[PDB]
């Protein structure tokens, strides 16, 4: 996939490597196979291999781990592709013991993704079934390539686990994934971090490299720097409504493993959602994904002319060959013209204007300490709980928590309107720093905002000059910190760093335009990603970013992962 290779970083090396380990493991379970999938893995895996590849290695069937009895199927092998979690082990046992004895015996194998755990195998041994697996194995799929500059773990629970449950299991896998990167792309000489989770990943990287027993890595470093950042250092950014094209698509429809599902009417029973893939392989999408949504119209018009001219030339040799490209480019323009229309419908409603006014009030310091009328109206009209929670948390973070009278008012109305089950929800938002009572000390956020210029009025959305174009005024704190690390360095902002959570550090790993790998521990938004691509294309900025994350998220999916499964 050509799009996985952007400038100096060729992420096919990683993808081709995991695609090879997969083949090799499938060959090891020789004879026909059915894979039983932990549901959560199916989507992410799609980015590594499709069914076409698995068929090549005699995978004749695929089921979802449901439990009870496995469907019959004349295969020699059954292979569980499961995450190392205990709940699932119990379900796996049901399957092994629910074996129909009125058929031929099917051999059982298990593939832990990304790797086994001690606790799990104890569950299987205690349940009896441990001894029934021929091959127990692991498939070290940690960082998944989503695009040429983008990798994700797609580990949804990671934020909740680290910040609420005292569980740093995801950080270990992150460190592991960084080792895999280093083995293919060279050791990363310089490590910088800000955050508690970032300190831990650093420590683990350094220890693991200490503990390495292979032949010597003789690869010239692709990445000059690693920057590890705790999501909880910037809790504001995900709460805000993203205003880039890709961000809006994600906010409204959601993008899952690089695909989106859209109302099908404008495109070409029941009629299934129009399913589209969204990454940089589609030229037009590369040109618009990162733009403020108000800039997209103009690119669309320009594309129309470029297409007409291509046909006008073909009207008056090489054009037989470009024609399959030309047709596809019209189709692409037609697809994104329709999406833009779907999005413009959302973004020109009165409710959207009002929400955005409030968000921008909070982000720029206005009335962050009083009960907000619009939020009250949304509650009274029983708008989506998540939208309400996003706003009350946005308020709380811009204010460093709320006074008692105001926090209590919001909790009582939320509980009364959406139900008392949401007392778990509010407890979690407080433990996570999102919606809390203030201390009655000074609110530090204004100092940070001013000093790092996080809010600016009347920003240019058509030809941006600053990272704030992605939220039409708010410069993501996270990206701003990346920017200032690169120039003029974090010593010039020591006072601000000290009033942000956890330590800031640097470490050096010894070796026999800079590229910086930036790793968001606890999630990253598409808007933040757009802003980092903006930094990478400034001629002056002297740093290009490759973005890594535990999870691609938005404020809606972020807060949902802090709610108790299942929903109402
Ligand atoms: Cl929206």
UniProtKB/Swiss-Prot annotation:
Gene Ontology terms: cellular component: autophagosome; clathrin-coated vesicle; CORVET complex; early endosome; endosome membrane; HOPS complex; late endosome; late endosome membrane
Domain of life: Eukaryota
Keyword NADP (UniProt): no
Its membrane topology: Peripheral membrane protein
Cross-referenced SUPFAM superfamilies: Sec1/munc18-like (SM) proteins
GO BP: any one term: intracellular protein transport
UniProt keyword terms in alphabetical order: Autophagy, Cytoplasmic vesicle, Disease variant, Endosome, Lysosome, Membrane, Mucopolysaccharidosis, Protein transport, Transport
InterPro entries: Sec-1-like_dom1, Sec-1-like_dom3a, Sec1-like, Sec1-like_dom2, Sec1-like_sf, VPS33_dom3b
Pfam short name (any one): Sec1
Compartment list: Cytoplasmic vesicle; Late endosome membrane; Lysosome membrane; Early endosome
Job description of the protein: Plays a role in vesicle-mediated protein trafficking to lysosomal compartments including the endocytic membrane transport and autophagic pathways. Believed to act as a core component of the putative HOPS and CORVET endosomal tethering complexes which are proposed to be involved in the Rab5-to-Rab7 endosome conversion probably implicating MON1A/B, and via binding SNAREs and SNARE complexes to mediate tethering and docking events during SNARE-mediated membrane fusion.
Protein family per UniProt: Belongs to the STXBP/unc-18/SEC1 family.
Subunit structure: Core component of at least two putative endosomal tethering complexes, the homotypic fusion and vacuole protein sorting (HOPS) complex and the class C core vacuole/endosome tethering (CORVET) complex. Their common core is composed of the class C Vps proteins VPS11, VPS16, VPS18 and VPS33A, which in HOPS further associates with VPS39 and VPS41 and in CORVET with VPS8 and TGFBRAP1. Interacts with RAB5C. Interacts with UVRAG, STX17, MON1A and MON1B. Interacts with VIPAS39; however, this interaction is debated. Associates with adaptor protein complex 3 (AP-3) and clathrin. Interacts with PLEKHM1.
Designated name of the protein: Vacuolar protein sorting-associated protein 33A
Organism: Homo sapiens
The encoding gene: VPS33A
